[PDB]
Structure formats: structure tokens, C-alpha cells
């Protein structure tokens, strides 16, 4: 009998796609115990545990510019948000593995690419040959589900505990942007030729692996002053990430050479053109009432331009 609830400005706004989490970092586990609550249920997971889990997450973030537990619960809200506008289209099982997969999908990030951990020949590369961070990511999230009183899936049978622990997996290892640009394609080409098929679980795998890549670049869906000032964030990742590059005695990409910081406008145009429009394209066709994400992308790469000609 135990409902939590936000303020009144919090209590609306959270329902909306572009809604920021804010900076009180305080508020977040109850922002993300709301959306659990909303979206799967007061009787999915023992609070006292879910309580323990979120906290020991939250412990395992690290202080990087970018990649760090606001990005977390940013994250879990986007999905929260596709979840709360298509109710009847998702298992029991996958809203309460969608949400933890977000939490989760960016555990222990140093703020370092895949490449720049295969480049400097970190012990992770050596372990996890592709999708390097995000196969960590898991491993760190099955790490924090044995830690004692930790197991939220503790209710779950031995079958509903391996199907979710899986779709945790697949969700997080979907994150990995190089794997985004044939997972997209693939569910064009099917959503076009019709073959779509929701009961096809490898199907649905994909549309999850969408969905995840779709929160994960959320930043791109919010106000233009939420949009730009976390490009600045992660750009300062990607610079920091140049600056190691260089100290290997290796020239870095563009995007991660700070000397061409008046690139960005133009590069975002790429980003926005290559893989955010397309992503929230695909996702709102195969699902209708996310095409809040596709418009706001389309709106934040109009402010973009505008940066661009001077206008701003
Ligand atoms: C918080 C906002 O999130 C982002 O901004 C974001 N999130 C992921 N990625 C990203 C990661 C890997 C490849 C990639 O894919 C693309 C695709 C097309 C263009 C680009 N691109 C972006 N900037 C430059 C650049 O040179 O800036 C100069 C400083 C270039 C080339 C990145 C894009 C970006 C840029
Ligand atoms: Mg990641
Ligand atoms: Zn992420």
C-alpha cells in the first residue's frame, strides 16, 4: 500500500518522451522506482531488494562526463515512455527486463570506446573480442543480481529467470552502435516485405535491439538546451578518449580530435542523417506512438542546421 509518486509538474511531464530526469541526482532511484511501478506493477519486485539493486548500480557508475548513472535512469525513462504507449505489445517478463536492461546497459563505462580499449590492449578486449564495454556491462549487471538480498528476479521460476536474464543480455549487448546499422536494415527490410512477425521471438529481439539503440540516444529527442548541452558532455568523453589516442602515437577520428571542435554542427548533421532519423524512422513505423522521438530528432537536427548558418 506503499505508491510512489513525484510532484505535480514531475507526475505529468514523466509520461512525455522528452521529459529530463533533472539534476537533483537524489531524486533518481525514485524517478526509476515510479516508472517500475508504473509500467510493470508495486508487486514485480520486493522493494527492499529493488531498493539495494538500484544503489549498488547507481555504486558501479562511474564520474565521467557522459556515460555515468544520469545516463542510466535517462535511458530507462525513454524506455519507460515506449513501454507506457504500447502496454499491450510486451510480455510481463520483457517490462521488467527492459527497464533493469537500461539501468544496467552502461554499468562500470570508463568513458572510453570499444576501439580505444581493443587500441590500447585493455584486459577487457583480450576477454570480449566484440562488443567489448557492452559484454562487460552484462557481466557487471549479473555481478550486482548475485550480490546478497540483490536478486529482484528472486520470485521469478527457474525458466521466466533465464528467458529474462537473456533478454537483459541481448538488450544490453544491442547497445553496441556498431551492431545498430544491421539490425536496422534488417527490420526495414522486413516491416517493407511485410515478413514483420511479433511472435517471431527473433523478430522481437530485433525490435528490442531498436528500442534499446532508441533510448540510448535519447539526448537527441529532448529540448534543444538538454540536446546541446549534453553534446557537450559527450564530446568531452570523445576529446579526453583523442587525447589517449594521440599519447598511443595514434591521429584520432575527427569526432574525438578536440582540435576540430568546429566540426560538431556538421558531424551532429552526419549523426542525425546516419543514425538517429533513421532509428526513430524505423521505430515509429513499427511502432506508432513513438513518433514523439522521430519529430523531436527532426526538430533538434533543425537546431542544429540553424547552428550551422549562423543563426544560433
Ligand atoms: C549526446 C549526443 O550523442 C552523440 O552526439 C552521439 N552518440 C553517439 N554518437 C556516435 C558514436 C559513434 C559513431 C557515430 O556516428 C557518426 C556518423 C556520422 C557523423 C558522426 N560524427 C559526429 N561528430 C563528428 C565529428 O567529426 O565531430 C567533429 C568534432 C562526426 C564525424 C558520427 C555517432 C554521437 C555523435
Ligand atoms: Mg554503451
Ligand atoms: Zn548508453
Given amino acids: 500500500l506503499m505508491q510512489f509518486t513525484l510532484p505535480v509538474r514531475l507526475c505529468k511531464e514523466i509520461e512525455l518522451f522528452h521529459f529530463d530526469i533533472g539534476p537533483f541526482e537524489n531524486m533518481w532511484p525514485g524517478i526509476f522506482v515510479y516508472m517500475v511501478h508504473r509500467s510493470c506493477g508495486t508487486s514485480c519486485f520486493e522493494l527492499e531488494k529493488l531498493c539495494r539493486f538500484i544503489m549498488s548500480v547507481k555504486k558501479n557508475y562511474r564520474r565521467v562526463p557522459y556515460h555515468n548513472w544520469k545516463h542510466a535512469v535517462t535511458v530507462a525513462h525513454c524506455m519507460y515512455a515506449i513501454l507506457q504507449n504500447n502496454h499491450t505489445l510486451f510480455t510481463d517478463l520483457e517490462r ?6 537500461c539501468l544496467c546497459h552502461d554499468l562500470d563505462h570508463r568513458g572510453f570506446s570499444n576501439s580505444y580499449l581493443q587500441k590500447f590492449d585493455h584486459p577487457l578486449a583480450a576477454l570480449y573480442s566484440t562488443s567489448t564495454m557492452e559484454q562487460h556491462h552484462f557481466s557487471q549487471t549479473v555481478s550486482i543480481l548475485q550480490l546478497e538480498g540483490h536478486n529482484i528476479f528472486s520470485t521469478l521460476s527457474s525458466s521466466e529467470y533465464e528467458q529474462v536474464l537473456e533478454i537483459i543480455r541481448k538488450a544490453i549487448i544491442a547497445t553496441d552502435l556498431a551492431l545498430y ?99 526513430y524512422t524505423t521505430l515509429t513505423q513499427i511502432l506508432p506512438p513513438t513518433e514523439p522521438l522521430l519529430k523531436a530528432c527532426r526538430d533538434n537536427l533543425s537546431q542544429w542546421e540553424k547552428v550551422i548558418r549562423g543563426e544560433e
Fill in 181 to 279: 546499422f544491421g539490425n536496422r536494415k534488417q527490420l526495414e527490410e522486413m516491416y517493407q516485405t511485410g515478413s514483420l512477425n511479433l511472435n517471431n521471438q527473433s523478430h522481437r529481439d530485433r525490435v528490442i535491439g531498436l528500442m534499446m539503440t532508441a533510448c540510448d540516444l535519447c539526448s537527441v529527442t529532448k529540448l534543444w538546451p538538454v540536446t546541446k548541452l549534453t553534446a557537450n558532455d559527450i564530446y568531452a568523453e570523445f576529446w579526453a578518449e583523442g587525447d589517449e589516442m594521440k599519447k598511443l602515437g595514434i591521429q584520432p577520428i575527427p569526432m574525438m580530435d578536440r582540435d576540430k571542435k568546429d566540426e560538431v554542427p556538421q558531424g551532429q548533421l552526419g549523426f542525425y542523417n546516419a543514425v538517429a532519423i533513421p532509428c
Fill in 96 to 101: 521488467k527486463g527492459l527497464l533493469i536492461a
